[PDB]
Structure formats: structure tokens, C-alpha cells
Write a protein that binds this ligand. Sequence first.
Ligand code: JJU
Length: 215
Amino acid sequence: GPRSIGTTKLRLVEFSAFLEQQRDPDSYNKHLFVHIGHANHSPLLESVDIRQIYDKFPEKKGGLKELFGKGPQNAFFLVKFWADLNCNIQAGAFYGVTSQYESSENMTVTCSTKVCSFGKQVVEKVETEYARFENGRFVYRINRSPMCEYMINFIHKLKHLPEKYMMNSVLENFTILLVVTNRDTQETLLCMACVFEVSNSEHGAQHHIYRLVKD
Ligand SMILES: Cn1cc2c3cc(C(=O)O)ccc3n(-c3ccc(C(F)(F)F)cc3)c2n1
């Protein structure tokens, strides 16, 4: 389906959370838990009433209601990810996150990743990205960013469960809020309220995009 998520001002074009393992000195394995390379869409985006997801993200000061309210509203998305947890976790391992945003405008952006448990923040990663002019447009690349220990521990404890339904029950209360801001104007460029489920057998990691609307 669609390649990227975002507006004309800012688009997320690439994203993957992965594990790199050195099997031996001449061998390397890479496994993707989640990525945006396979949109399960056949497009005009379907919408979700934002009031149905407030409980799942931090509220009060700095919260999703406050952010959505300040706008712009066309920059707010709900992204459903199916996580691929089929990998043998073996020392010589790297858990990383790669993301790439693009713009027509030359900006300095702030990328905030809030990991949430039961709607409450457990981790916040703030990364500042400066525009790189590449073949006609500005690119903001966060290459191989180290995964936070919380998330490394979470992936291990989730894999330990003997059934996908048990992992889905855990992932029901696990969310990620991604916010990209113009560091100089303070304008919200892109907001993604991420929800998670485990992928169904042989299909692999997938995602589905919805527009967040108030009414
Ligand atoms: C859209 N998004 C952003 C991220 C992200 C950031 C980090 C980080 O910066 O430390 C770590 C893991 C992250 N994942 C992520 C989610 C679920 C699973 C799991 F457990 F389901 F496999 C595995 C990784 C994400 N998805």
C-alpha cells in the first residue's frame, strides 16, 4: 500500500526496529521486529475518533489531547503495527532503530519517542535531526539508533510467553507515541500514536495507517 506516513511538510519514509546478531566472525543476521515496508492497504485514509485512544497515551500537560488541540490536525495518525517476534535470540547482538523523514523545507527537527505502558510514559528518547540536502529534498536520518534497555528487556520477556494470544494481551497495554517538531517554530510536524499486535504466522511485520480526527 502507501510508502510513507505524514503530510507534505514532513513524511516518515523508512522505519525499522531490529536485532543484528553475529553468528560467527564472518556471519551476520538481521531480524526486523517492526517496519513500515509493508502497508496492508489495497488510497483515501480511513479515520479514527481520537477520543477512543486518549486512555492509551499520556495526558494532562504535554499530552496527546493538548497536542492534537494545538494541531495541525492533518499531522495526527494512528498506526497499528504487527510485530514479527520469530527470531532466535543467541553476545555479539545489537538492538537498533532506523528512521528516515523527508521534507521540502530545510528545518531542524526534534524527534520524540515516548514508550508507554497502560497509557503512562516509561521511556522518552529525544533526538535532534538536522536537514541533509539529498537529490532534491531534505532528509532527516536517524541511522542504527540504540534501542533502550526497557525495549530490549520487553522483547525478551514477550518472546518467553508460549502463545501469541498471551503476547497480544500484553501488547494491548503497550503503545508508542512518536512526535516530530520543528525545533525553531515549535510546530508539530508529525504525530504518530502507535498500537501493536503480533504478526500472524508467515505474513511477517506489517502496518496499517488511520487519520486521527476529533468528531
Ligand atoms: C513505531 N515504533 C517505534 C519503535 C521503537 C523505539 C525504540 C527505541 O527508540 O528505543 C525501541 C523499540 C521500538 N519499537 C518496537 C515496538 C514493538 C516491538 C515488539 F516488542 F512488539 F516487537 C519492538 C520494537 C517501535 N515501534
